[PDB]
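Re-run requested by the PI after the first attempt was lost when the workstation crashed. Everything re-entered from the original request form. Ligand of interest: HER.
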Amino acid sequence: SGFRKMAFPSGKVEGCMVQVTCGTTTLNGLWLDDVVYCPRHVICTSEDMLNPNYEDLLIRKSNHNFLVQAGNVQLRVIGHSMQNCVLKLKVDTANPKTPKYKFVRIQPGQTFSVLACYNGSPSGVYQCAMRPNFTIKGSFLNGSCGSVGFNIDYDCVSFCYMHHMELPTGVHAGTDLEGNFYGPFVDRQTAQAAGTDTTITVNVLAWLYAAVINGDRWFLNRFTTTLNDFNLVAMKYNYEPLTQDHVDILGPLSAQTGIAVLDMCASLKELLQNGMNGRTILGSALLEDEFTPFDVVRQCSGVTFQ
Amino acid sequence: SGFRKMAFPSGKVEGCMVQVTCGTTTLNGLWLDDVVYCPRHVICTSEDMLNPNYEDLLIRKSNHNFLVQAGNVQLRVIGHSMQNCVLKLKVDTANPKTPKYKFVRIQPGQTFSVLACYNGSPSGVYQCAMRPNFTIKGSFLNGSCGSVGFNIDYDCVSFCYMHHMELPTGVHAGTDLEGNFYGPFVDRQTAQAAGTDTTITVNVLAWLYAAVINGDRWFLNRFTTTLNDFNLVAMKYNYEPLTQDHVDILGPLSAQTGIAVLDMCASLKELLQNGMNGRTILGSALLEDEFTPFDVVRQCSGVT
Ligand SMILES: *c1c(-c2oc3cc(OC)cc(O)c3c(=O)c2O)cc(O)c(O)c1O
Ligand SMILES: *c1c(-c2oc3cc(OC)cc(O)c3c(=O)c2O)cc(O)c(O)c1O
């Protein structure tokens, strides 16, 4: 038994990571078919950080100003263009390791794996959630910009995130693979409020179901509640409101454990109002919100990939 | 910045995972050069589980009793032998995806990544520590037997663990890649005690340094302690005793942060005696012991 915050196997994404240099800036790019994707701030200099005019900066660049290196191989750049906040470099060779892939824009509270890379070289992989305020609590040292987040379905990689920046608060912000930021953020070095973060309620509930499946039961209380009553408590404790859609995706776990969703909500309500009293759940003293209901079902089912 | 429990990128190991079937038992194997490694209990039947005589059971098997599938393609087994608790199936094809590799036996408290596989296919990857009692806290679904644990040094994979069994407590036990179990365990379906686990003190200290590097400094004090005095407290809270070797390996973190090792020990001593009183460290309400000093340095310096 047990429960780990597992990441997706990263091999299919490892084969897509390249290094992109423009001027004196070097970061990570994603090479799929004959296109390399990377953050457009690769064209900034240290003098351009506070408010770059990306259109004017890019007009100064030609194809030969972009150095793209895949391992030891130098790729020939035959076109460049900007799509929102992502630079797209057309190269003259398709990546022979291109997996089946999609570009997806995920919802706040959904999870994905990040392949943290530095200067084109994979460093580590970890699983995380897109916070309700559209930030990531990652591990991104300088040189990790352009690292990507993804999910896998059997043999198809769904890319959902590209890392662009660390905010002054220490949290991380990025885009989908069409270059549109998650959240209100812009790619310039300024103070930017992320606004109130909240706890992903449906994920906490899923993790409580995981705990029951692993043999925990001390927090199962004698109460039930209603959706409206629970959401009164959720808002008081900066938890995301629960919808019937959330209740529906919790259905499989409720069926397996025999614990009606609103009963588990009542037990979560008691934990929020009474605290943990020094007790742990799945070894944790805080409530965990980086497992989606699907994540729990996958691990409990031993779902595998190519 | 930020600090995550990162696993190694799994691609080099993914290319080595195969499916091994003997009779009606199917589990994971590791294909390196022209050898496939898997737990020898693949040759057990349901009536063999309580006390298998593996030498007798293997004698009844020939090469054609082993079905190895790599992707959609059957590999021809041309030889078989038992090394301690691992079965080595010689195949007629060298794995073309064999990475540079070594087999290593790790120490209790060291960390590695596990590629959790079922029936030859990966489910996910996670970072873990070998507990001081030589067990592993793994993923949920039983039957990932033959999945491996590893570290990567640039392009070279150091395999250190093969999963063999879940103990009745649910924790995982396994071998090195020469088939020697970590801990006292045997590959039989019997009640087996793992004995007292302890917290990996040198790892907690490393993680406290990681917290200071990331801006959490509230637990620092200017109290002095000695190794002997610290260990008096650590033993009371079921922490592993700290040795001079442990102090020595924390040196690089002391050197980059400006916090002496014994100063961090005095900070941990106060944390154990006083508790955290509702405060968190790196977002955690409990002290984390699954980062080695080397792990912290790697992550904080961006090794790839
Ligand atoms: C990552 C970065 C990198 O670049 C930026 C650019 C910004 O505005 C143009 C803002 C911002 O917050 C930011 C970062 O946080 C950040 O990490 C820069 C360089 O040179 C490299 O190599 C990265 O990997
Ligand atoms: C994993 C196992 C598997 O096998 C064993 C065998 C044991 O003694 C012979 C003991 C033991 O505790 C044990 C396990 O916990 C365990 O998971 C069996 C099968 O069939 C498959 O497919 C595995 O992956």
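Saved to the shared folder this time. Chain A touches chain B through 56 residues (CB under 8 Å).
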